[PDB]
């Protein structure tokens, strides 16, 4: 997990379901579209 990355912007929208960070909107408009699972046990987490 190096910080082999630079590029300042804007985080408005944020999916949690997997964790991923979004820019844009149509972006996230379609990344819930692949989201068709539901919330099941299996990511223990605290
Ligand atoms: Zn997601």
Do not use: N
């Amino acid at each position: 997990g190096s910080s082999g990355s630079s590029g300042t912007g804007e985080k408005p929208c944020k999916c949690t379901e997997c964790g991923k960070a979004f820019c844009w909107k149509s972006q996230l408009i379609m990344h819930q579209r692949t989201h068709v699972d539901d919330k099941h046990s299996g990511p223990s987490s605290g």
